[PDB]
Every structure is written in C-alpha cells, then in structure tokens.
Amino acid sequence: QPEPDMITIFIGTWNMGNAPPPKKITSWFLSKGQGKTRDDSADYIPHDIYVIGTQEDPLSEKEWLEILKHSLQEITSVTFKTVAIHTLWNIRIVVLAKPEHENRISHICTDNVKTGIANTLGNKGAVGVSFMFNGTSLGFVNSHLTSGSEKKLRRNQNYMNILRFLALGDKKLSPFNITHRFTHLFWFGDLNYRVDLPTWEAETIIQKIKQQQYADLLSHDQLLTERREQKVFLHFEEEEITFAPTYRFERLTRDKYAYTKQKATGMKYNLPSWCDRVLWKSYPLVHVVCQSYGSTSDIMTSDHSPVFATFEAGVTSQFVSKNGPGTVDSQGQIEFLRCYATLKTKSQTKFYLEFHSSCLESFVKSQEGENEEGSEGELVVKFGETLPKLKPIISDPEYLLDQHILISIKSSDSDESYGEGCIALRLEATETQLPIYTPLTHHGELTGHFQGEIKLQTSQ
Numbered sequence: 001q002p003e004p005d006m007i008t009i010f011i012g013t014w015n016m017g018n019a020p021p022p023k024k025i026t027s028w029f030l031s032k033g034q035g036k037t038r039d040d041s042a043d044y045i046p047h048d049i050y051v052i053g054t055q056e057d058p059l060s061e062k063e064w065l066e067i068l069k070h071s072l073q074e075i076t077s078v079t080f081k082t083v084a085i086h087t088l089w090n091i092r093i094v095v096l097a098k099p100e101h102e103n104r105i106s107h108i109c110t111d112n113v114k115t116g117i118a119n120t121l122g123n124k125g126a127v128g129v130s131f132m133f134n135g136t137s138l139g140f141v142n143s144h145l146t147s148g149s150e151k152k153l154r155r156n157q158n159y160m161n162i163l164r165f166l167a168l169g170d171k172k173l174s175p176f177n178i179t180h181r182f183t184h185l186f187w188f189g190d191l192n193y194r195v196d197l198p199t200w201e202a203e204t205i206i207q208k209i210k211q212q213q214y215a216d217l218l219s220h221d222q223l224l225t226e227r228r229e230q231k232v233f234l235h236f237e238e239e240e241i242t243f244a245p246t247y248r249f250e251r252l253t254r255d256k257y258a259y260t261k262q263k264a265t266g267m268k269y270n271l272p273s274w275c276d277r278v279l280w281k282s283y284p285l286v287h288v289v290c291q292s293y294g295s296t297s298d299i300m301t302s303d304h305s306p307v308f309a310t311f312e313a314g315v316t317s318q319f320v321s322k323n324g325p326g327t328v329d330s331q332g333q334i335e336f337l338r339c340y341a342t343l344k345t346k347s348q349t350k351f352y353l354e355f356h357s358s359c360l361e362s363f364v365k366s367q368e369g370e371n372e373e374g375s376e377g378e379l380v381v382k383f384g385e386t387l388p389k390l391k392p393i394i395s396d397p398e399y400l401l402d403q404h405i406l407i408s409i410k411s412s413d414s415d416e417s418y419g420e421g422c423i424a425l426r427l428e429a430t431e432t433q434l435p436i437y438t439p440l441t442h443h444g445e446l447t448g449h450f451q452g453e454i455k456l457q458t459s460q
C-alpha cells in the first residue's frame with residue numbers, strides 16, 4: 001500500500017455557548033451551509049484527519065468524543081481513531097484520524113496556555129496538538145481570545161503569549177516557537193475580533209447581512225485590519241470570507257442577531273462579527289489548498305454558528321536509505337553563500353547562526369558574522385562564504401528537495417535568538433547558486449531578513 005503524498009484535513013471551530021449540541025451536527029463535518037462549501041458528490045469521502053476546536057464547551061471529554069465519533073460514522077461508515085484530546089476549562093481540541101493512519105501518526109504532543117493576569121486569568125487561552133504524519137509535522141491550535149469590541153489589542157497580546165508559550169513539536173527546535181516548528185500549522189478558534197462600526201449602525205449592518213453584502217463589513221473586521229497592519233498573525237493565511245457573521249445569534253433560530261447590551265453581556269454591544277476563524281501557515285513551497293471555509297445554518301443551540309474549513313495538505317514519506325538515518329550521505333551538501341542578515345535591533349553584540357532541519361543529524365552552529373551599518377540605520381550581519389557546509393543524512397533528491405532549513409540568528413553575548421526563519425530546498429536547480437530569502441521573526445513579530453544564495457548537491 002503506497003504512502004500518501006496528499007491528505008485532506010477538516011478544521012472545525014465552534015463556541016458552543018455552554019449549551020449541549022443538537023442531536024444532528026453532520027452539516028458541520030460535511031462543510032454545508034454558507035460560504036465556500038463542499039460538493040455533495042464528496043459527502044461519503046472521509047477526510048484523513050478531523051480537528052475539532054470548541055469554546056464554552058459544557059460536555060465532558062467522553063460525552064463529546066461519543067457525539068463526534070457517532071457523527072463521523074453516520075457520514076462515512078468509518079470508525080475514527082482518537083489521536084488526541086486536550087481541554088483547558090471549557091476550551092477543547094479533539095483530533096480524529098482514519099484507522100489506516102494510526103501507524104502513520106506518532107510524536108503526539110498536547111499543551112495549553114492560560115492568558116491574562118489575576119482578573120483576566122481563569123477562562124481564556126489556547127489548547128494545541130502536534131504530531132508527525134509520516135515525514136510531515138502538523139500543529140493545531142484552538143484559541144479563545146479576549147472578548148469585547150474595545151479589546152483588539154488584548155487579543156493581539158493573547159496571540160503573542162500563546163505562540164510564545166505553547167510547547168508543541170520537537171523540543172530540540174529550541175530557538176523556534178510554534179510558528180516555525182511545523183510543515184503545516186492551523187490556528188483557529190473564537191478569536192473574538194469584531195466588526196468595528198458604530199453601535200448606531202447595528203440595524204444597517206443586519207440589513208447588509210440579509211442582502212449577503214459583506215464586502216464593506218469585512219473592510220471593518222478587526223482581524224483583517226490588524227493582520228494588514230502586521231499587528232497579529234504575521235505570515236498566516238486565511239481563505240476569503242463569504243459567509244455571514246457567526247456571532248451573536250439568538251439561540252434556536254439563525255433569523256436574529258442579538259446585538260443589544262444586556263446585564264448578561266456586562267452592558268456591552270455585540271454587533272454581528274466574524275468571531276470564529278481558521279488561519280494557517282505552511283512552510284514555503286509546500287502544497288496547501290483551502291477547499292472549504294464556511295458556517296453551518298442548521299446548528300442553533302449556541303449564540304455562535306460552527307465554522308468549517310478543509311484543506312489539501314502535502315505530506316512526505318518516512319525516508320530510509322543505505323546511509324541515513326544514522327549517518328551522512330556524502331553525495332549530499334547544502335552551502336549557504338554570500339548570506340547576510342538585516343536586523344531591526346539596536347544591540348551591538350556579535351551574531352552567529354543556527355541551522356536546524358530533520359535532514360541534519362543535529363543542528364549546526366556557524367561562526368560569528370561581520371557587523372556593518374545599513375545606510376538607513378540598520379544592523380547588517382555578513383557571513384560571506386564562511387558558513388559551515390551542511391551534511392544531510394540522505395542525498396536522494398526525491399527526499400532532499402522536499403526539506404526545509406530553519407535559521408536562527410543568535411547573540412554571542414546572550415545566546416538568545418533575535419530572529420527565526422525558514423528556507424525551502426525545493427529549488428529550481430541543483431549544483432547551481434540560487435537566491436534565497438526569509439523574513440526573520442521573534443515572538444512572531446518582524447525583526448529582520450535573511451538573504452543570500454544557496455547551492456544544493458543531491459545524488460542526481
């Protein structure tokens with residue numbers, strides 16, 4: 001039986017509003033309702049992996065896993081296996097996979113992060129799951145961020161705390177946070193960003209929603225505006241939104257948005273908003289295609305509607321050769337030539353690089369670079385042709401051209417990373433000097449750039 005080179009992944013996010021679900025939730029897993037929906041001819045075809053994030057989830061793990069498994073079995077006639085389940089108070093992530101994938105999935109990790117201090121600590125935060133699927137690392141984050149139209153900056157803070165502190169994936173990747181540890185990272189949840197229009201416009205907004213005229217509303221969505229100003233989710237993607245706002249509904253219908261201030265809301269307005277979102281970030285030049293992104297119309301127990309997204313995701317096989325794993329393949333080499341980092345830092349330490357990759361036996365430390373002043377005020381760290389020649393464990397181009405090199409630039413004085421990035425080995429040519437580039441981030445914010453040339457030798 002050949003190993004797959006593609007899988008499909010279902011992402012669901014649903015803020016359940018502390019209510020049990022209705023008896024039928026199959027529309028969710030079928031990507032049926034509003035937005036970019038899945039074709040009827042696919043309804044019996046199981047996704048490879050289902051990742052369900054809930055918020056305000058009132059059920060036990062057992063109660064929810066029985067509902068999920070029974071739902072998928074009814075759709076697909078497949079009994080899914082549980083990869084992982086992790087709950088932080090009423091925030092939960094479930095990962096289910098087809099039985100044939102059980103032997104393909106390993107290195108399963110779970111973690112959570114609680115956001116806030118004192119007053120603001122006790123119910124918001126994130127859960128996450130990571131694992132290997134053959135040669136491919138996958139990470140999944142379900143976050144419930146701070147509520148309220150006025151609190152976008154708090155949400156942005158919650159995002160940075162989650163990507164700093166959530167401990168998933170390979171712990172040897174110590175300079176790297178979750179935004180660099182996975183081939184594919186999916187981040188979803190009740191992100192709680194609102195449509196930032198005046199309160200007095202509530203009925204106008206409702207009118208626009210009834211006319212399915214979302215364009216002007218989306219131009220005021222706080223997550224899209226914060227992302228466009230590089231305040232949050234830097235280097236993540238989101239599919240175009242073509243479904244109505246998923247919050248705040250009167251329960252047991254979808255005919256009414258309940259936006260007016262009430263004692264139960266702390267006297268806050270909840271104008272119709274796209275609270276419930278799915279974003280992703282994949283390594284450069286890896287196949288990832290969103291095939292659905294929408295909301296259900298028939299699940300009405302909560303004041304939120306469920307959101308679905310589905311993806312094609314490229315995956316690679318576990319590779320064994322006669323040499324690696326457990327030695328190098330002297331036919332392979334990676335040379336980084338005429339490289340320089342451009343950093344936003346005002347520090348004057350010396351810097352060294354680390355190169356991390358599952359195509360190396362272990363990470364490689366460079367010599368210190370040569371610091372110069374950039375003509376617009378910046379630090380430029382030059383590495384010349386001084387960089388260590390990297391020795392991959394396998395030289396076969398069918399393996400090596402699918403790999404990635406993570407780069408950290410670290411202070412000699414403190415050994416702290418000032419920036420992290422990723423270079424694809426999916427080159428136009430081997431044995432040929434070719435331009436490379438990555439932005440560098442630290443704690444998910446832009447700190448610089450790395451650019452230069454690469455020369456890749458494979459067994460071909």
Ligand SMILES: Fc1ccc(CNCc2ccccc2)cc1
Nearest residue numbers: 081082083097101102103105106
């Ligand atoms: F649904 C799932 C439940 C459990 C798992 C864990 N499988 C680990 C494994 C891999 C290879 C051989 C033996 C064990 C993976 C998926």
